[PDB]
Scaffold this active site. Structure first.
Site, PDB file in Angstrom:
ATOM      1  N   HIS A 112     132.114 100.008 108.511  1.00 16.49           N
ATOM      2  CA  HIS A 112     131.703 101.648 108.856  1.00 16.49           C
ATOM      3  C   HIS A 112     132.912 102.631 109.142  1.00 16.49           C
ATOM      4  O   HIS A 112     133.045 103.001 110.005  1.00 16.49           O
ATOM      5  CB  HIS A 112     130.776 101.481 109.814  1.00 16.49           C
ATOM      6  CG  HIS A 112     129.347 100.716 109.814  1.00 16.49           C
ATOM      7  ND1 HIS A 112     129.116  99.531 109.987  1.00 16.49           N
ATOM      8  CD2 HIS A 112     128.368 101.273 109.016  1.00 16.49           C
ATOM      9  CE1 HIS A 112     127.871  99.334 109.657  1.00 16.49           C
ATOM     10  NE2 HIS A 112     127.518 100.253 109.078  1.00 16.49           N
ATOM     11  N   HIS A 155     133.166 103.659 103.491  1.00 19.00           N
ATOM     12  CA  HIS A 155     131.610 103.804 103.331  1.00 19.00           C
ATOM     13  C   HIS A 155     131.131 104.977 103.276  1.00 19.00           C
ATOM     14  O   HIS A 155     130.182 105.299 102.658  1.00 19.00           O
ATOM     15  CB  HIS A 155     131.220 102.900 104.603  1.00 19.00           C
ATOM     16  CG  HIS A 155     129.964 102.767 104.753  1.00 19.00           C
ATOM     17  ND1 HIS A 155     129.051 102.302 103.714  1.00 19.00           N
ATOM     18  CD2 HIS A 155     129.101 103.445 105.849  1.00 19.00           C
ATOM     19  CE1 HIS A 155     127.653 102.552 104.202  1.00 19.00           C
ATOM     20  NE2 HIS A 155     127.590 103.282 105.372  1.00 19.00           N
ATOM     21  N   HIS A 189     127.308 110.710 108.450  1.00 18.65           N
ATOM     22  CA  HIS A 189     126.311 109.707 108.942  1.00 18.65           C
ATOM     23  C   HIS A 189     126.646 108.408 109.729  1.00 18.65           C
ATOM     24  O   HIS A 189     126.009 107.822 110.368  1.00 18.65           O
ATOM     25  CB  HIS A 189     125.454 109.343 107.795  1.00 18.65           C
ATOM     26  CG  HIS A 189     125.780 108.141 107.153  1.00 18.65           C
ATOM     27  ND1 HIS A 189     126.558 107.888 106.060  1.00 18.65           N
ATOM     28  CD2 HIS A 189     125.481 106.543 107.253  1.00 18.65           C
ATOM     29  CE1 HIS A 189     126.846 106.557 105.699  1.00 18.65           C
ATOM     30  NE2 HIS A 189     126.149 105.835 106.261  1.00 18.65           N
ATOM     31  N   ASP A 190     128.084 108.196 109.679  1.00 15.59           N
ATOM     32  CA  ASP A 190     128.706 106.815 110.401  1.00 15.59           C
ATOM     33  C   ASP A 190     129.925 107.399 111.238  1.00 15.59           C
ATOM     34  O   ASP A 190     130.666 106.614 111.631  1.00 15.59           O
ATOM     35  CB  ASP A 190     128.715 105.931 109.433  1.00 15.59           C
ATOM     36  CG  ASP A 190     127.858 104.859 109.263  1.00 15.59           C
ATOM     37  OD1 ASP A 190     126.857 104.710 110.350  1.00 15.59           O
ATOM     38  OD2 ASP A 190     127.576 104.347 108.323  1.00 15.59           O
ATOM     39  N   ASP A 222     122.808 104.519 101.496  1.00 15.40           N
ATOM     40  CA  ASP A 222     123.521 103.666 102.323  1.00 15.40           C
ATOM     41  C   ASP A 222     123.097 102.404 102.400  1.00 15.40           C
ATOM     42  O   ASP A 222     123.927 101.297 102.392  1.00 15.40           O
ATOM     43  CB  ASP A 222     122.871 104.073 103.850  1.00 15.40           C
ATOM     44  CG  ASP A 222     123.570 103.622 104.954  1.00 15.40           C
ATOM     45  OD1 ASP A 222     124.748 103.780 104.910  1.00 15.40           O
ATOM     46  OD2 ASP A 222     122.774 103.447 106.181  1.00 15.40           O
ATOM     47  N   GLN A 254     122.435  87.407 102.199  1.00 16.13           N
ATOM     48  CA  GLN A 254     122.501  88.628 101.126  1.00 16.13           C
ATOM     49  C   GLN A 254     121.298  88.425 100.417  1.00 16.13           C
ATOM     50  O   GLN A 254     120.455  89.503 100.032  1.00 16.13           O
ATOM     51  CB  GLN A 254     123.697  88.521 100.141  1.00 16.13           C
ATOM     52  CG  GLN A 254     124.975  89.165 101.242  1.00 16.13           C
ATOM     53  CD  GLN A 254     124.724  90.558 101.454  1.00 16.13           C
ATOM     54  OE1 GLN A 254     124.402  91.437 100.763  1.00 16.13           O
ATOM     55  NE2 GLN A 254     125.056  90.613 102.684  1.00 16.13           N
ATOM     56  N   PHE A 274     118.330  89.490 102.537  1.00 14.48           N
ATOM     57  CA  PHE A 274     118.503  90.925 102.658  1.00 14.48           C
ATOM     58  C   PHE A 274     117.804  91.647 101.385  1.00 14.48           C
ATOM     59  O   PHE A 274     117.350  92.639 101.722  1.00 14.48           O
ATOM     60  CB  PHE A 274     119.835  91.329 102.883  1.00 14.48           C
ATOM     61  CG  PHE A 274     120.001  93.049 103.727  1.00 14.48           C
ATOM     62  CD1 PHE A 274     119.367  93.039 104.980  1.00 14.48           C
ATOM     63  CD2 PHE A 274     120.555  93.785 103.199  1.00 14.48           C
ATOM     64  CE1 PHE A 274     119.534  94.529 105.184  1.00 14.48           C
ATOM     65  CE2 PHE A 274     120.884  95.112 103.539  1.00 14.48           C
ATOM     66  CZ  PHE A 274     120.002  95.434 104.875  1.00 14.48           C
TER      67      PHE A 274
HETATM   68 AS   LIG Z   1     123.164  97.401 107.822  1.00 10.24          AS
HETATM   69 AS   LIG Z   2     124.803 100.535 107.319  1.00 10.35          AS
HETATM   70 MG   LIG Z   3     124.719 103.500 110.151  1.00  4.47          MG
HETATM   71 ZN   LIG Z   4     126.300 103.808 106.580  1.00  6.66          ZN
END
Ligand SMILES: [As]
Ligand SMILES: [As]
Ligand SMILES: [Mg+2]
Ligand SMILES: [Zn+2]
Ligand SMILES: [As]
EC number: 3.1.4.53
Length: 351
Positions: A83, A87, A123-124, A241, A292, A295
């Site tokens: 993050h 990213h 956003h992060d 994202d 993965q 997910f």
């Molecule tokens: As995540």
């Molecule tokens: As994320």
């Molecule tokens: Mg986030």
């Molecule tokens: Zn993100």
């Protein structure tokens, strides 16, 4: 201005080559970072805003824009494995590509386009590299301030808007009060929606919308009311994202190595503080491949499948790549024997 980026002509030429993919899913943001003194978010955002003439439309001088972006980018933590600004740059550029998908042509206003890309960019911001639950469990001042609810997400927004007040950083100075109010409303909506604990609700709502789906004689989607437009936008950013598994394997593998490194670092912090190790955060138990696959099967694929349905056939190649990547990871599972937050999900749905 290239001078603000401190880039020489040689690397500027390299960037010109890389940026040929500015409007493509195959853009390599890692390469962009390498040629821009690791300022991928500011560089890609500047490229995007130039490409979309956003600076012209909203009366944002290159000076104000770069000053704000460089300030924002510096508030991402370069020592956080995933993050970080790379990213954010990736999500911003990915959102920039999704916004131009044929099915959404001429659907959004310039303010909505501005809001979506801005949302992706911030956003992060100031992400500490640990989950909301970690902040809550340690009795973090941040969790106490936000009453344990979407702690980091609320913070990212507060920081993103607060930085507009620093010297020469108000990129929204020339928007009307009404435009600022509307953009702020949309940005808050989209960033709060990046909280993985809201995923299932988002997808469900998105599916419900795909049912009432409406198009033009040419096929373009029809979204004439605000509620539907913001719903598509919040899901769009969410998809960006969660786009790592939809990129070429070379990139996807790097993103995965990074998120695992970040989880492991949180695991180290938990061990250091006498806390029980969170799911996915113990390198000596974490099944990267299985995680993965699971997910993708339970979170990523369902989401992209729905998005692809909404913009069909626009996202077909994305689904194919996602499938190929999923099967590659499934094949990489060491030849073995027989919650509501990203980490919890990955452990639960573990293939
Ligand atoms: As995540
Ligand atoms: As994320
Ligand atoms: Mg986030
Ligand atoms: Zn993100
Ligand atoms: As640049």
């Amino acid at each position: 201005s290239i001078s603000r980026f401190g880039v020489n002509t040689e690397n500027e030429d390299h960037l010109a080559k890389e940026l040929e993919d500015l409007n493509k899913w195959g853009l390599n943001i890692f390469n962009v970072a390498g040629y821009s003194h690791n300022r991928p978010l500011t560089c890609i955002m500047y490229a995007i805003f130039q490409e979309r003439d956003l600076l012209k439309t909203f009366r944002i001088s290159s000076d104000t824009f770069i000053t704000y972006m460089m300030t924002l980018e510096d508030h991402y933590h370069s020592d956080v494995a995933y993050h970080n600004s790379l990213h954010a740059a990736d999500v911003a550029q990915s959102t920039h590509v999704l916004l131009s998908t044929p099915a959404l042509d001429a659907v959004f206003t310039d303010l909505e386009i501005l809001a979506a890309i801005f949302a992706a960019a911030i956003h992060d911001v100031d992400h500490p590299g640990v989950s909301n639950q970690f902040l809550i469990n340690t009795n973090s001042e941040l969790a106490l301030m936000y009453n344990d609810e979407s702690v980091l997400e609320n913070h990212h927004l507060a920081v993103g808007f607060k930085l507009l007040q620093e010297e020469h950083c108000d990129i929204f100075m020339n928007l009307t009060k009404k435009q600022r109010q509307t953009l702020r409303k949309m940005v808050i909506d989209m960033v709060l929606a990046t909280d993985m604990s809201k995923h299932m609700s988002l997808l469900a709502d998105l599916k419900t919308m795909v049912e009432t789906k409406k198009v033009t004689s040419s096929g373009v989607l029809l979204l004439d009311n605000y509620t539907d437009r913001i719903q598509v936008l919040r899901n769009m950013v969410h998809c960006a994202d969660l786009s790592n598994p939809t990129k070429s394997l070379e990139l996807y593998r790097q993103w995965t190595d990074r998120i695992m490194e970040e989880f492991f670092q949180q695991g180290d912090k938990e061990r250091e503080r006498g806390m029980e190790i969170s799911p996915m955060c113990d390198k000596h138990t974490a099944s990267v491949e299985k995680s993965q696959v699971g997910f993708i099967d339970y979170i990523v694929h369902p989401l992209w499948e729905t998005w692809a349905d909404l913009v069909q056939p626009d996202a077909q190649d994305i689904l194919d790549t996602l499938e190929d990547n999923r099967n590659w990871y499934q094949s990489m599972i060491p030849q073995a024997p027989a919650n509501r937050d990203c980490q919890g999900l990955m452990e639960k749905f573990q293939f």
